[PDB]
């Protein structure tokens, strides 16, 4: 470019629930700081030329009641928990998604 960069360059990344009190508003700002946007939901996704889709997660304040247990079926993007936003904005670099995407594995306390 010229005067700008950004780590992202042309990214789509949607914050679903509430989180705790913060990775909300302050999530979609600090991913836009790095050269992604903001998305209002899963659908809002469009394939223009250089925007990937990517999606955000938080098994926190989201509890149980509903069932977490069909993120990626519900979304047609990766999920991965504010720790990618906040690892990628603190450094500053587009992290692996899959060090905070849905991990999904047999059994669960052993």
Known sequence: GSQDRKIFRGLEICCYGPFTNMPTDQLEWMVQLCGA??????????????????????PDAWTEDNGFHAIGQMCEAPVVTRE???????????????????????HSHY
Not at 37 to 53: D, M, Q
Not at 93 to 104: F, M, V
């Open 84 to 106: 990618w936003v906040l690892d990628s904005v603190a450094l500053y670099q587009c992290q692996e998604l899959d060090t905070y995407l849905i991990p999904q594995i047999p």
């Open 37 to 58: 946007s903001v998305v209002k939901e899963l659908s809002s996704f469009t394939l223009g030329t250089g925007v990937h889709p990517i999606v955000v997660v938080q």
